[PDB]
C-alpha cells in the first residue's frame, strides 16, 4: 500500500542523520507522508543547527523510492584520518556512539592532512547527501582534533557551492556539549558531482540516500 512513515519518538533530523536510537524500521522503501510527535525526544543528539530543515522535511514528505548506500566507505576512504570518533552525548545503551550516516573524522598521529573526496551520481536518481561541520568550544580542542586553527570545509556541487569555517566559541552546555555541529544537506541530481575538500572540523558523510520524490 502507501501507509505513512512512522517515526515514533524520533524527528526527521535524527531519522535522516542516523541517530543511534533512530535506526529501527527506517529503511522503508516508500511512504506517502511522515508522522512524528509534536515534541520529539530523539533527533540531533550532538547539539547544532539543522540548515534548511523545513525544506528537507518537505522534500522527504512523499517518496516512492528510498535506499541508502555507503557513499564513502569508512574502512576504505579515510586512510590518514581517524574515523572511530564517538560522543557521550550520542549515547546508546550505556555506550558513547555517533550518527551512523556520518563520520567524525579527526587527526591521526597528531596530523590532519587536507582531504579531497568526490562522488559521481551514476544512480539515475536523486541522491541526498548530508554532512556536518564541527565547532569546538575552545581553540585548544581545535588543535587537538584537527591540528590546524585555520580550518576550511568546501562543499562544491554543480548546483551547490558553500565554504565553511569553524566559529570557535564556548556555547551553553547542552547534553554535556559546549560545542556545536551544524548539519547541511543537498540533493545531487543524476550526473552531478559533489566535492568535499577540508583540513578539519568536517563531519564526513558515510551513507547517502538515493531517492525519488513521487507518489
Amino acid at each position: 500500500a502507501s501507509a505513512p512513515l512512522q517515526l515514533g519518538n524520533c524527528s526527521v533530523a535524527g531519522w535522516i542523520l542516523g541517530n543511534p536510537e533512530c535506526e529501527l524500521l527506517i529503511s522503508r522503501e516508500s511512504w506517502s507522508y511522515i508522522v512524528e510527535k509534536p515534541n520529539p525526544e530523539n533527533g540531533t543528539c550532538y547539539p547544532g543547527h539543522f540548515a534548511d530543515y523545513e525544506e528537507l522535511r518537505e522534500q522527504l514528505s512523499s517518496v516512492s523510492s528510498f535506499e541508502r548506500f555507503e557513499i564513502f566507505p569508512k574502512e576504505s576512504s579515510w586512510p590518514n584520518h581517524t574515523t572511530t570518533g564517538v560522543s557521550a552525548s550520542c549515547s546508546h545503551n550505556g555506550e558513547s556512539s555517533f550518527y551512523k550516516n556520518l563520520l567524525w573524522l579527526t587527526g591521526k598521529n597528531g596530523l590532519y592532512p587536507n582531504l579531497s573526496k568526490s562522488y559521481a551520481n551514476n544512480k539515475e536518481k536523486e541522491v541526498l547527501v548530508l554532512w556536518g561541520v564541527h565547532h569546538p568550544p575552545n581553540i585548544g580542542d581545535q588543535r587537538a582534533l584537527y591540528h590546524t586553527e585555520n580550518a576550511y570545509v568546501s562543499v562544491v556541487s554543480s548546483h551547490y557551492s558553500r565554504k565553511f569555517t569553524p566559529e570557535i566559541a564556548k556555547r551553553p552546555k547542552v547534553r554535556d556539549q559546549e560545542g556545536r555541529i551544524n548539519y547541511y544537506w543537498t540533493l545531487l541530481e543524476p550526473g552531478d558531482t559533489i566535492i568535499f575538500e577540508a583540513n578539519g572540523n568536517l563531519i564526513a558523510p558515510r551513507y547517502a540516500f538515493a531517492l525519488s520524490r513521487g507518489f
Partner: antibody
Amino acid sequence: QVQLQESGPGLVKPSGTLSLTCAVSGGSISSSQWWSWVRQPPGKGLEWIGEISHGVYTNYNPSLKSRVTISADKSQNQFSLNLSSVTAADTAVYYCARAPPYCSSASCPDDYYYFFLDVWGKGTTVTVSG
Amino acid sequence: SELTQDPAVSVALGQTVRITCQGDSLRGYYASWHQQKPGQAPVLVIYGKNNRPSGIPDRFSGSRSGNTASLTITGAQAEDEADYYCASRDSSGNHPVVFGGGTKLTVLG
C-alpha cells in the same frame, strides 16, 4: 615506528643550566601530540617536567615552572629541555616521551581524554655535582 | 588532586594481584599504567580504561570505579616483577600531569 633519543652533557655544575635534546624519527614534532620530558631521581618515582605541542605550545610542572623552558626545532624534528639554577635535587635520569592529544572541554570524542606515554626514550643520566 | 598508590605489594606465581591508584584527577581523564623494570625505561601496559598497546599480554587489565583506578595482573609471572606507576591529567587550570607514588610488585614464585 616512532623512536626517541636523548642527548645531553651528562654533568652540570650547581646553579648551572641543564640542556638536553630529544631527536625524533618516524614522527613529527609539529604534530598535535604532546612531546614530554620526564625525570626520575635515584631511588624515587617518576616526576613530570613539561610538554610541548605543535612546535610552540608548552605546559610545565608548577613545582618547577620558574626555571624550565621547553623549545622545539621543527626544521631538525627535535625538541630540547632547559633547566636553570640546578641543584643536587635535580640529579636524575631524564626521559623524553610522546603523549596523546587531549581536550580541555567535555565536547570531544572519547579517544581525546587519555593520557599515556607510549613511546619512551632510552633516557640520559644527568649528574649535578660540580 | 593527587595520585596515591600502595608502596609495595606481593603476589605468588599464578595468583592475581590488583594495584589500586586513587586520586580526584581520575574523574576527568582516563588513567594509564606504566611498567618499569630495574635499569630500563618505563613501558606502557595500559593506554587507559582497560586498553592495552600491541605486544602487552592480556593478563594486564584496567578498571575504574569513580576516583580509583585499578591495574589487575591475572596469573602473575616472574617477569611481571617491576615498578608500576599510574598517570593522568589534572582537571584544573592548565591540566598538569600527575604521576602516582609507584608500586613495587614482588613475585614470590
